[PDB]
Amino acid sequence: YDYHFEVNGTVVRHKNKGFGYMERFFELKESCDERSKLSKKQYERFNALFNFFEKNGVICMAKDAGTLNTSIEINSLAYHGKYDVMKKFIEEQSVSIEDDYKKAFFLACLGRWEESYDLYSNIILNSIDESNGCVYYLSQINRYRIYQSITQAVTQFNGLGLLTFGRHYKPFTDEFLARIEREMTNFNIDDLFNGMPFEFQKKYKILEFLSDNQFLYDDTVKLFELTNKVRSEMSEGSYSFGMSSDIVVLLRLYDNLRFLYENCLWSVSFHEFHQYIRNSMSLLIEKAEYERTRDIDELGFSFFGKKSGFFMEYYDFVNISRHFKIDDIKNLERS
């Protein structure tokens, strides 16, 4: 809690009573001569830091913040809907444990839920011999989510599927279902981050919210508050300089998508995750529509004398085509 990182990559001072090690790094960013004032070892540490930060979207200290054009890119093959290249990928030979994790997520996506659990149980056994921490912790989480998926699938097939398809289709062998209930019988997820070694509890604390349910509560409440803000401002005739209350919504949505798709986490297909994207994009399109029609005296356009116009890009179409239903889309169609 030393500093405060805004959603734009800026940094502000929060709880610092000593030297500003963020400030020193950020002045070292622009000082080439001081960058030359390090050993080759320290120069390499700074280079690793610089690459990590530039990949993480952080830019500069808020005091020197100018015009920031943050980049966005989604690189998970599952997002682009390339179901054939992934099919080729799965058949290939595994090399490292990270490839095993990625292939586990890929198997999860293509609807072959059966072998995904077995591969996950394989990697969970084979993981530690290399002394890796993160992979095990994420592999248990993915495992519990996929177990929830299997149980809900079998119940839903038995309940309404018989009427839905007309045949009691059984996708999972009985012995597999018998096993999965045994292994995770008493699995209460809350303790997963409280049971791992203390060494793991000091490095990757940031990955704690993925255990319990709160990781889709914290962001949902912030989206609700932002939605209240933009709705209140929409019926006052108000103008927002700089960042409106709505650009934060776009930035949070895209950052969340990057974190939940690149890392190969399986929470992508859950309904509660769709709930977030629904009310995010709906709000964005509503804001665009409101901007398209209103009145100004003289200075209204003089404030931000242009717009994004909500030029709706390709990622936007992918998101809307994925995480909506027809009944949902017609609601935006009416308004």
Partner: protein
């Protein structure tokens, strides 16, 4: 005792070719939404049209329950329509006495349930089922209602 006031309902499915019974005693959401509209059609030629009645029309229905019905679900465990017969009652506001019953009938229903309700925490069942009113190319269908209040 102060303020709230609610009600109840009753749902009654039936598969044609026989009196197969599947039903829900309640429907809490029970979101019923009729809908009629039109956007564009017609060639606008031939001078005299001599007609026009196009109104598309379609009905939406919703139900919650956990009673898929105890025996033949398990029978088929190991497409002759799903006609439903809604039923309820209505009261006279002046006397607040139960004096009228209401029956709603649908002749040809097709179930279209979004089969991706995989949620993220163990829920209290509630497998919401949504229904579409279907009609052959023959005649009539959709809505027929029975009403009491013979007093």
């Amino acid at each position: 005792m102060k303020t709230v006031i609610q009600d109840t309902a009753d749902v009654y499915f039936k598969r044609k070719s026989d009196g197969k019974l599947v039903f829900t005693a309640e429907a809490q959401t029970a979101s019923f939404s009729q809908a009629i509209s039109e956007e564009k059609l017609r060639g606008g030629i031939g001078n005299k049209p001599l007609y026009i009645l196009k109104s598309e029309k379609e009905i939406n229905l919703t139900v919650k329950n956990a009673f898929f019905d105890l025996e033949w679900l398990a029978m088929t465990q190991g497409s002759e329509r799903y006609e439903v017969e809604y039923r309820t009652i209505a009261y006279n506001p002046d006397t607040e006495e139960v004096y009228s019953d209401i029956y709603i009938q649908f002749p040809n229903v097709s179930p279209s349930g979004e089969f991706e309700m995989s949620l993220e925490n163990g829920n209290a069942l509630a497998p919401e089922i949504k229904f579409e009113a279907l009609a052959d190319t023959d005649t009539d269908e959709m809505a027929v209602v029975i009403e009491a209040s013979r007093d």
